[PDB]
Structure formats: structure tokens, C-alpha cells
Design a binder for this molecule. Structure first.
Ligand SMILES: *[C@@H]1O[C@H](CO)[C@@H](O[C@@H]2O[C@H](CO)[C@@H](O)[C@H](O)[C@H]2NC(C)=O)[C@H](O)[C@H]1NC(C)=O
Ligand SMILES: *[C@@H]1O[C@H](CO)[C@@H](O[C@@H]2O[C@H](CO)[C@@H](O)[C@H](O)[C@H]2NC(C)=O)[C@H](O)[C@H]1NC(C)=O
Ligand SMILES: *[C@@H]1O[C@H](CO)[C@@H](O[C@@H]2O[C@H](CO)[C@@H](O)[C@H](O)[C@H]2NC(C)=O)[C@H](O)[C@H]1NC(C)=O
Ligand SMILES: *[C@@H]1O[C@H](CO)[C@@H](O)[C@H](O)[C@H]1NC(C)=O
Ligand SMILES: *[C@@H]1O[C@H](CO)[C@@H](O)[C@H](O)[C@H]1NC(C)=O
Ligand SMILES: *[C@@H]1O[C@H](CO)[C@@H](O)[C@H](O)[C@H]1NC(C)=O
Ligand SMILES: *[C@@H]1O[C@H](CO)[C@@H](O)[C@H](O)[C@H]1NC(C)=O
Lengths: 295, 126, 112
């Protein structure tokens, strides 16, 4: 059973800058003290990301956006609202659907032909007499039908909490769809009460390499709502950006982890740094390989 | 009703292995991570180890010399301290307590401090 | 880790007022605590998780008599109109990255 709880408020998406976010490890080999150059789907530095936040002010919004080539995800978290996604192509009818979910202790991955209503949510019920809270609710899909794939593992979204103060749980994700393999990268970084993508660097670790092979064009993010304007609750804000085919140059530190990445298509200084393969450049003339224009 | 009952006492020479448990009922374990606390006789209580809701373990507090191990069987609705290598100082009460931060929470995260405590068991070791 | 300079013995008259003190290391000035009362020969009882601003989160069966206050990097628990049951051990504990702390306990020999 599902219900028309839209209460959608229309506001323009406040485009904001990520400042050198969205880079991951391109390969599964331990290098160190090297400047390996790679060409892969990466979020470009100083790129427009979409600040989506449906809360504060009964403002609820959760539109269907295009997976394009990849989807950089962030989830500055306060009270565990973002619970998963429903990647797919049509998200209804007779087509194949993906229902990436992060449960209370595990991660359930199902690629199947689910039917979806317009406003999917996960509803948690709290009782006074027994106090047990159960996820025994399913309103993202009405039912499931002629199903193909199921996967249970350790959950992606991990607390990493217990520490105090102003630090926040910034949860980063990278989704890409290549050779029918939905690759998922993630890392979690504490941030000292920042209201914007932090000024630092990220190293997104590989999590799963799912052998799915399904068409994914219009993805969407699940949320969790309590019971209690029926079925409303929480507080959340997340940020979505898209990966494009670019070229980066990564410098590896002495621990084997990346320190900083120098893009090859934003600034003339970065193009010269890319075409000379070094992170320090002196004064002079540096002929640059051509990455400025793409037809 | 929330309650934390334990069992698995025993007298052994140092280096022996026993079976400690914290059975509970009346509330969800899936969304509650559990801690362990050690209280030497006449001394202050000191936590030893804990397991998270997902399944990750922390054998911290540097009093455990790689001797204590924690696990959990969510299927059987029970909580075990995977126990081996008891030593002389380990003769103490082992109050197991349930943290206030359940996984489906609101408000500020002034939680993970224990709201309830088990009755505790005395595991005498010499 | 943080150390608690809580007096091993503090006392006052019954029906009077006292103030317990939980001291905390300067490195974690804005850190919060929670108070556990360990009545002797029984289990611990949780009173309040004290915010850095003195806000309250209360356990069952504890009246408004037991209250908490904060000032600087150190913390207080307030008791007014003392009764017979106060002779017990009080433990102030904290949070970290997987590292609880707890304290020596506040054996309290309220004379009366
Ligand atoms: C969410 O996690 C819970 C675990 O507490 C799952 O509940 C059981 O999960 C196992 C394996 O995942 C199944 O074999 C059982 O049949 C489940 N019992 C139930 C649902 O009562 C649950 O499957 C997970 N997924 C969802 C969507 O709730
Ligand atoms: C305590 O919780 C359990 C589930 O964790 C309840 O069992 C079901 O609770 C749901 C509440 O959403 C009811 O709709 C079902 O009818 C219950 N099942 C059965 C077989 O009755 C249980 O009822 C709860 N205890 C209460 C409400 O006193
Ligand atoms: C993957 O999905 C896209 C989107 O549904 C498919 O593109 C459609 O292809 C049909 C082919 O007749 C066209 O009529 C539609 O106009 C296309 N729609 C869009 C939005 O492009 C695509 O063919 C699918 N298969 C791939 C990419 O191999
Ligand atoms: C990002 O969006 C803003 C409008 O919100 C726009 O002015 C800016 O040019 C965009 N960034 C880039 C690199 O175009
Ligand atoms: C799809 O479902 C129908 C029944 O709804 C079934 O007859 C058919 O075999 C299923 N096909 C696949 C590929 O699972
Ligand atoms: C890792 O980095 C830290 C600090 O940068 C350093 O102490 C250590 O030697 C490095 N290497 C390893 C193997 O830990
Ligand atoms: C702490 O205790 C002392 C003595 O009882 C008192 O002067 C002081 O006001 C107390 N502080 C608070 C915040 O109640």
C-alpha cells in the first residue's frame, strides 16, 4: 500500500561548489610516491553540484534525476534519513529495477522488476507498549515481481560515531555503471560544523563490484519517515553531482593513499601540470597538450 | 520490558576460557549496539570492549591485552562476549549495559551513554 | 584520556544541598558526560546525560532534585534536600571514538 504524500515545494536548486571532491582509487594495486595518471569518470573540480534538502520550514521533495554516466553523492547526516536508492530506467511498468538499500545492520541489493508509486519512503513504527521498532514496511514498491537478483552484505552507510563536538558525519558515494557492473565507492569524513562541501581531499574506497548488467538512466534516493500530515518526520540535506569523462593526475603519498589530485581540464596551470607530469612547476614557458576544448 | 540477564561464571586459573553472555528481551537488538563494562572489587568500573549494530568490534581500553573478544548472535536474540584467556585481575563483576542511542533516533546525539544496566555476574579467577 | 579530580569523600547534612564535581581534561573542553549512580551491592543506575549547556535527559524514577550544570571544561551534578538513599557510588563517564572513560567513582559518606 502506498499513498499520495507529495507536499512538494518548488524552489530552484541552489548550485554550489564541491571544491576538489569525488575522486577515488582507479585501480586495485598498492602504489606509493608515484604520479600515476588516469582517464576515468571523475567529478570535475569546482563543478556545479545540486544542493537538495527537503525539510525545515512540511517541505518534502525527492525528484527523479538522470544517472547520466555516474552520480556523485553526499549525505551530510544528522538523524539517519537517507537510507538507500532505487536506481533504474523507468522506475515502474515492466522494466528492470535496482533497489540499493542500507538496513539497520546489513545491505540488501535486489535487481528485480518492482513496481513503484510516485513517493517512495521507508516507514518506521514506534510503539508504546512494546517499544520495538521494525522496518517491516514496504511502500517504495507495492510488491515484487518475477525477480532475478538478491544480495546481502555488510551495510555501506556506517555510523563511525561515538566522538563528540562539532564534527559531522559527511557520507560520500560514487555510482557508475560500466560493463553491467554497478561499482560503488565511499568514504566517510568528519567535518567541523561546515555548511558546505569541506575544503580538503577525499579517497573513496571500493565497496562492491556488482555483476548486474541492467540499464540505469533515472536514479532516485530513498528516505526514511517515521509514523506519528500523516507519515512525516526527520531532517535531511544531500548533494548530487554527475561524473563526466575527464583526465586526472594522482600523486600517491608514502602510505599508499592519495594526497591531492590535479585536474587536467579546468585551468591553464592545471593543464601545464598535467602535460609536464609534476605537482610543482617553476617559472617559464610550458607547452600544453590540448585538453581545453571538447567538440 | 527492557532487561539484561547474564550467565557464565566460573573459577579458573589464569589463561582459561569460559562462556559469558548477556541475554535480553523486550526491545530490538538490530538497532541497539552493546557495550561491556568491568568493575574490579572495590575499584572503579572500566569498559573493556563492545560490538556495534552492524557487526564491527572494538577491543579497546588497553586493559584487554588482546585477550577478550566480542560477538553477537542477533538471530537467537542474545549477546555473547566471545571469551577466552581469563587472567588474575579479571575476577570482577561484568555489568553489561545497553546504550541509549538506538539506530532510529532523533534529537542531538548525546547518546551512547548507558540508560540501563544488567545485574552483572561475578567471575572469580585466581 | 580525561581524568576526574572528583573528591574521594564529600559530605553534608541531610535536607541540605551539595554539588558533585566531574572534572575533565583540557583537551576535550566541550565534551559531554553522563552520570551513573551505583548503589552498593546492586547495579548501576543512570541519572542524566549532561550537555555542555546543562540541559537534561532524565532516567526513570529520578526526581527534579537531581540536576546538572556546566561551566567551562568541567561539569557539575546538583543534589538538594538530601535523604537516606544518597549513600552510594557515583560515576561520571564520557564518549570518544570508541573509547568510553568512566571515573574512579565518588564514594560519598554523607554524614547524618
Ligand atoms: C533488514 O535487516 C533485517 C535484519 O534484522 C532482515 O530481517 C531478516 O533478514 C534475513 C536476512 O537478510 C532474512 O532471512 C529474514 O527473513 C529477515 N526477517 C524478517 C524480514 O523478518 C531483513 O531481511 C533486511 N531487509 C529488509 C528489507 O528489511
Ligand atoms: C510489538 O511489536 C510487534 C512487532 O515488532 C507487534 O507484532 C505486530 O505489530 C504490528 C504493529 O505495526 C501489528 O500490525 C501486527 O498485527 C502485529 N502482529 C501480530 C501477530 O499481532 C506487536 O503487536 C507489538 N506489541 C503490541 C502492539 O502490543
Ligand atoms: C538504455 O536506456 C535508454 C533510456 O531508456 C534507452 O534509450 C532509448 O532508446 C529507445 C530505442 O528505440 C529510444 O526510442 C528512446 O528515445 C531512448 N530514450 C532515451 C532517453 O535515450 C537505451 O536505448 C537503452 N539501451 C542502451 C543505452 O544500450
Ligand atoms: C554553478 O551554478 C551557478 C548558478 O547557481 C553559475 O553561476 C555558475 O557559473 C556555475 N558553475 C560553473 C562552473 O558554470
Ligand atoms: C516475468 O513474470 C511473468 C509473470 O508475471 C512470468 O510469466 C515470466 O516468466 C517472468 N519472466 C522472467 C524473465 O522472469
Ligand atoms: C603512514 O603515515 C603515518 C603518518 O603520516 C606515518 O607515521 C607512517 O610511518 C606511515 N606509514 C605506515 C606504514 O604507517
Ligand atoms: C556548586 O556547589 C557550590 C556549593 O554547594 C555552590 O556555591 C554552587 O552554586 C554550585 N553550582 C551550581 C551550578 O549549582
Amino acid at each position: 500500500q502506498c499513498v499520495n504524500l507529495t507536499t512538494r515545494t518548488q524552489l530552484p536548486p541552489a548550485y554550489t561548489n564541491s571544491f576538489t571532491r569525488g575522486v577515488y582509487y582507479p585501480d586495485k594495486v598498492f602504489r606509493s610516491s608515484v604520479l600515476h595518471s588516469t582517464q576515468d569518470l571523475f567529478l570535475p573540480f569546482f563543478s556545479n553540484v545540486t544542493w537538495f534538502h527537503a525539510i525545515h520550514v512540511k517541505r518534502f521533495d525527492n525528484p527523479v534525476l538522470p544517472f547520466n554516466d555516474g552520480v556523485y553523492f553526499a549525505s551530510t547526516e544528522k538523524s539517519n534519513i537517507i537510507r538507500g536508492w532505487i536506481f533504474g530506467t523507468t522506475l515502474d511498468s515492466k522494466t528492470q529495477s535496482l533497489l540499493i538499500v542500507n538496513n539497520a545492520t546489513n545491505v540488501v541489493i535486489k535487481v528485480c522488476e518492482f513496481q513503484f508509486c510516485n513517493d517512495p519512503f521507508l516507514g518506521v513504527y514506534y510503539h508504546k507498549n512494546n517499544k520495538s521498532w521494525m522496518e517491516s514496511e514496504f511502500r517504495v514498491y507495492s510488491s515484487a515481481n518475477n525477480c532475478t537478483f538478491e544480495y546481502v552484505s555488510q551495510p555501506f552507510l556506517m555510523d563511525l560515531e561515538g566522538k563528540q563536538g562539532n564534527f559531522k558525519n559527511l557520507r560520500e558515494f560514487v555510482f557508475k555503471n560500466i560493463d553491467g557492473y554497478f561499482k560503488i565507492y565511499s568514504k566517510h569524513t568528519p567535518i567541523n560544523l561546515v555548511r558546505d562541501l569541506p575544503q580538503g581531499f577525499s579517497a573513496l574506497e571500493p565497496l562492491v563490484d556488482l555483476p548486474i548488467g541492467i540499464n540505469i538512466t533515472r536514479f532516485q534516493t530513498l528516505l526514511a519517515l517515521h509514523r506519528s500530515s500523516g507519515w512525516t518526520a526527520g531532517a535531511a540535506a544531500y548533494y548530487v553531482g554527475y561524473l563526466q569523462p575527464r583526465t586526472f593526475l594522482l600523486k600517491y603519498n608514502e602510505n599508499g593513499t592519495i594526497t591531492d589530485a590535479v585536474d587536467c581540464a579546468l585551468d591553464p596551470l592545471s593543464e601545464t601540470k598535467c602535460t609536464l607530469k609534476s605537482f610543482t612547476v617553476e617559472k617559464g614557458i610550458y607547452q600544453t597538450s590540448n585538453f581545453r576544448v571538447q567538440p | 520490558e527492557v532487561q539484561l540477564v547474564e550467565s557464565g561464571g566460573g573459577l579458573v586459573q589464569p589463561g582459561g576460557s569460559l562462556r559469558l553472555a548477556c541475554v535480553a528481551s523486550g526491545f530490538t537488538f538490530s538497532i541497539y549496539e552493546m557495550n561491556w563494562v568491568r568493575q574490579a572489587p572495590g575499584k572503579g568500573l572500566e569498559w573493556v570492549s563492545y560490538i556495534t549494530t552492524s557487526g564491527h568490534a572494538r577491543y579497546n581500553a588497553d586493559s584487554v591485552k588482546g585477550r577478550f573478544t566480542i560477538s553477537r548472535d542477533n538471530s537467537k536474540n542474545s549477546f555473547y562476549l566471545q571469551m577466552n584467556s581469563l587472567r588474575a585481575e579479571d575476577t570482577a563483576i561484568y555489568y553489561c549495559a545497553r546504550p541509549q542511542y538506538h539506530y532510529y533516533d532523533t534529537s542531538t546525539y548525546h547518546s551512547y551513554g548507558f540508560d540501563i544496566w544488567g545485574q552483572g555476574t561475578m567471575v572469580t579467577v585466581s | 584520556q580525561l581524568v576526574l579530580t572528583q573528591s574521594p569523600s564529600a559530605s553534608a547534612s541531610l535536607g541540605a544541598s551539595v554539588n558533585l564535581t566531574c572534572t575533565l581534561s583540557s583537551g576535550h573542553n566541550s565534551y559531554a558526560i553522563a552520570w551513573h549512580q551505583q548503589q552498593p551491592e546492586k547495579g548501576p543506575r543512570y541519572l542524566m546525560s549532561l550537555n555542555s549547556d546543562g540541559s537534561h535527559t532524565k532516567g526513570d524514577g529520578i526526581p527534579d532534585r537531581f540536576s546538572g550544570s556546566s561551566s567551562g571544561a568541567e561539569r557539575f551534578l546538583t543534589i538538594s534536600s538530601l535523604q537516606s538513599e544518597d549513600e552510594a557510588d557515583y560515576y561520571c563517564q564520557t564518549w570518544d571514538t570508541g573509547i568510553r572513560v568512566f571515573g574512579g567513582g565518588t564514594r560519598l559518606t554523607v554524614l547524618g
